[PDB]
Design a protein around this nucleic acid. Structure first.
Ligand code: MG
Ligand code: MG
Ligand code: MG
Ligand code: MG
Ligand code: MG
Ligand code: MG
Ligand code: MG
Ligand code: MG
Ligand code: MG
Ligand code: ZN
Lengths: 60, 94, 69, 91, 114, 244
RNA sequence: AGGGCGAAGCCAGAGGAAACUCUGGUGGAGGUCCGUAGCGGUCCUGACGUGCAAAUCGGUCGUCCGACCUGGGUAUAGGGG
RNA sequence: AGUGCGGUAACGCGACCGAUCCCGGAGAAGCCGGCGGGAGCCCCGGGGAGAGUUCUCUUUUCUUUGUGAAGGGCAGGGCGC
RNA sequence: GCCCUUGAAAAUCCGGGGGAGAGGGUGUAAAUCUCGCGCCGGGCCGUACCCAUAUCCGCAGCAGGUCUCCAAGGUGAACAG
């Protein structure tokens, strides 16, 4: 019964304003959301650099 | 003053900054002078001072601390030891 | 315990005074040879079956050779 | 003055302790947490370890200094006097 | 879920009573009590903050068991002192003695002069 | 009625000093031929914090001049001391900082600390934190020296007795406000049971002479004799003048 | 436990002739706020009042990283602690 | 002749004389935050073995699906070499 | 990061500096902070169970008190309910 409902939660369901009790930051912490991004974009940048796409100075 | 004569050396002459590199320059027998900042570690200085004595090379104790000398080489980094291989057209070497 | 890599080495270990039981585990695809000593239980993995059957004969004076099943 | 107009370091304390005290603390509270320059290597790493003891992280030169500053003025003025007298005695 | 108990009469979670989970061949999670973390020796110099290389960082009463080679390194001041501080001690101790000789020479010349 | 808080501190018990984590006494080197006649050299191995003390100390190691043995000391750190420095001391010691030499040698106007009150005592006056004494003036015969202490007093002293040149380290500690009671609590806990202090006016009149009353008042003059039995000697003892 | 507020430091962008200032971030300070366990014990002048109890119970409350709570060891003894 | 040898070096190799003496280390260190790695557990997708459900529906839902210490190897962490 | 807080001793164990000594004389020696194997030993006391709305203390199987470890699914910010 849970598994079924989790599949609903995947589709984007039982997830609107009136089924949230925690603050947004509690639900997804802003710091973590930031950490992901830096760890993405930085990883994109140093992959670009290490393929000779972008030079040292651009990268920096 | 020494800062003026250096300026010209750094511009036109050949040189080398730092202890690992200048000790290799003296050891080759190319280095004609060795500038030491005043704050340099005491063991380091005496070691260098001996290396010049063996290689019959000038050793000039700089008036300033290693930040001042590096500033005085025209670098934003700081240099404690600096060898002057070939001055360009300066009279840093007398 | 201790694994051994040379058929000779296990034969030398089996030939000691301290040794005793030299039980033999036919695992299929493996045929071990576990020889107990004072300190350690030496084992030797002999992948071939005919080579294991040959070694079976080469243990010396009347040791236990307590084959395992 | 990005976040605060006029509290800075002493914004931690919130409303508490009174305006004068918090103004008085801001001077020290800054200096004591300052990273100074190790007159030994020349890196900016002289950092107070505990009261009166400042440590360069690179140089590894622990240095008995002031309570909230690598140098008190008193120490400095005392240093120069002693140097003067030393020279006066020996010649 | 299999919860579990301590295996000794020490109830309190302490420096002495540290554990880890292990699955046995019997297929039951069981506490094993863990040995304290040994440290490599720090240098005799006393400025170099980093601990020494080529030494088995292990609880000191073990060293007893260990072979000599684990406990040290093949150098003068081996496993007592970091290399850097040896090769500075060396050239220091040399350069100092060369100057002591130079001052001895300047003293002897001054005696001969006077 | 009661024995008052104050009378009770003499019995020690709870009011003894806390001294587990204290790193040792902060003496000077003991006198000997080398100190007396020449100068012994030692090196500052480290600079230390000593709980319940505002001054930092200095492990200074010498060589015992009789046994092959590296003896060590705890000097109070002269401000501007640092590690890997040498610290010379004796009669023929050079007049620079962190350098213990007899007051008789050092010239007038010479700032010192950890100064021996009596020769061989191992360092008694001016050893606090921002404090020092100044050598005033010498009387060559009588072998005596006049010294100005931090309290202001101008004490006479034997010219033989030693002092470390320079002021004590960690000065200006008391410029910082404490603010938090907590911050007070944490100070005295590394010292002794002397903190949150209750005013005798607060107390009932059995545990203090100011106690009792329907209004928290003193009731008698708060100045008092010093020919005063312990139990009354409370408030302002032998107070020559009292106001602002 | 879990949340809130978001101090110094740091980044970028914009302005400024300079001094430096704004905007967006990041950062995570504090005898900081909410709030659990914990510690406590406001009000109901509630329950009980030959009690469950020689001081307890229920809800409601205060505090909850600090002058925090707490086991064991150890010290101070009667005009004494 | 012979109180072992290898590496530029960090250091290495199964052993590698040695006293009183000396120096050093380990034992041997607060709290708080953040981030990362490793396990235990949870989760998901499937394989099996046994279950329950089956009026209709459900390739179902439920259980269960292991490797001690000590050695050797190798990842994976870290290095102020 | 915080401190006018700087946060245990000792038993025990090792490393290094030194070089007093010892070893045999061309097949062996003394040596193994010994490498690998082999042999022998490890006495003494505690060890049941309860550990708490019934094995403890509150005269009792008393709504009180009494230090810890482990810690599943769902909902949910959550060791909240
Ligand atoms: Mg214990
Ligand atoms: Mg090694
Ligand atoms: Mg009263
Ligand atoms: Mg009275
Ligand atoms: Mg009532
Ligand atoms: Mg009734
Ligand atoms: Mg009942
Ligand atoms: Mg039992
Ligand atoms: Mg229970
Ligand atoms: Zn070192």
């Amino acid at each position: 019964r849970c598994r079924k409902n989790t599949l609903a939660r995947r589709k984007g369901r039982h997830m609107g304003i009136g089924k949230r009790k925690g603050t947004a930051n509690a639900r997804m912490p802003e710091k973590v959301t930031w950490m992901r991004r830096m760890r993405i974009l930085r990883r994109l940048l140093r992959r670009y650099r290490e393929s000779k796409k972008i030079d040292r100075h651009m990268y920096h | 003053s020494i800062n003026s004569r250096l300026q010209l050396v750094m511009k036109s002459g050949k040189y080398v900054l730092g202890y690992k590199q200048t000790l290799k320059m003296i050891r080759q027998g190319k280095a004609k002078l060795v500038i030491l900042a005043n704050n340099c570690p005491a063991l380091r200085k005496s070691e260098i001072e001996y290396y010049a004595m063996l290689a019959k090379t000038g050793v000039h104790h700089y008036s300033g601390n290693n930040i001042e000398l590096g500033t005085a080489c025209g670098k934003y980094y700081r240099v404690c030891t600096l060898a002057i291989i070939d001055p360009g057209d300066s009279d840093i070497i007398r | 315990p201790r694994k051994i890599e040379e058929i000779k080495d296990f034969l030398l270990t089996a030939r000691r005074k301290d040794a005793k039981s030299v039980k033999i585990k036919k695992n299929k695809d493996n045929v071990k040879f576990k020889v107990r000593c004072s300190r350690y239980l030496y084992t030797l993995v002999i992948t071939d079956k005919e080579k294991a059957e040959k070694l079976k004969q080469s243990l010396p004076p009347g040791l236990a050779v307590k084959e395992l099943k | 003055a990005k976040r605060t107009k006029k509290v800075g370091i002493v914004g931690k304390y919130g409303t508490r302790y009174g305006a004068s005290l918090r103004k008085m603390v801001k001077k020290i509270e800054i200096s004591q947490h300052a990273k100074y320059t190790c007159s030994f290597c020349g890196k900016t790493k002289m950092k107070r370890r505990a009261v009166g003891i400042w440590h360069c992280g690179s140089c590894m030169k622990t240095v008995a200094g002031g309570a909230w500053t690598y140098n008190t003025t008193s120490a400095v003025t005392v240093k120069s006097a002693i140097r003067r007298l030393k020279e006066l005695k020996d010649q | 879920v299999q919860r579990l108990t301590y295996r000794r009469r020490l109830s309190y979670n302490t420096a002495s009573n540290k554990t880890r989970l292990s699955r046995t061949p019997g297929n039951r999670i069981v506490y094993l009590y863990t040995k304290k973390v040994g440290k490599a020796p720090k240098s005799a110099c006393g400025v170099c903050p980093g601990r020494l290389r080529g030494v088995r960082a292990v609880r000191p009463k073990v060293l007893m068991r260990l072979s000599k080679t684990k406990k040290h390194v093949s150098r003068a001041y081996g496993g007592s002192m970091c290399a850097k501080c040896v090769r500075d001690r060396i050239k220091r101790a040399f350069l100092i003695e060369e100057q002591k000789i130079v001052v001895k020479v300047l003293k002897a010349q001054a005696q001969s002069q006077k | 009625g009661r024995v008052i808080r104050g009378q009770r501190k003499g019995a020690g018990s709870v009011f003894r000093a806390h001294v587990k984590h204290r790193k040792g006494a902060a003496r000077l080197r003991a006198v000997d031929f080398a100190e007396r006649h020449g100068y012994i050299k030692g090196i500052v191995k480290d600079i230390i914090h000593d709980p319940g003390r505002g001054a930092p100390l200095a492990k200074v190691v010498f060589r015992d001049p009789y046994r092959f043995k590296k003896r060590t000391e705890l000097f109070i750190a002269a401000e501007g001391i640092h590690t890997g420095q040498f610290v010379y001391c004796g009669k023929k010691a050079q007049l620079n900082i962190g350098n213990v030499l007899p007051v008789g040698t050092m010239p007038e106007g010479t700032i010192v600390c950890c100064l021996e009150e009596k020769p061989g005592d191992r360092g008694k006056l001016a050893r606090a934190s921002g404090n020092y004494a100044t050598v005033i003036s010498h009387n060559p015969e009588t072998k005596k020296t006049r010294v100005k202490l931090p309290s202001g007093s101008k004490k006479v002293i034997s010219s033989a007795n030693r002092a470390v040149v320079g002021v004590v380290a960690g000065g200006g500690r008391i410029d910082k406000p404490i603010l938090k009671a907590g911050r007070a609590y944490h100070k005295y806990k590394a010292k002794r049971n002397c903190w949150p202090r209750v005013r005798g006016v607060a107390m009932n009149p059995v545990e203090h002479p100011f106690g009792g009353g329907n209004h928290q008042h003193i009731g008698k003059p708060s100045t008092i004799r010093r020919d005063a039995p312990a139990g009354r000697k409370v408030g302002l003892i032998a107070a020559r003048r009292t106001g602002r």
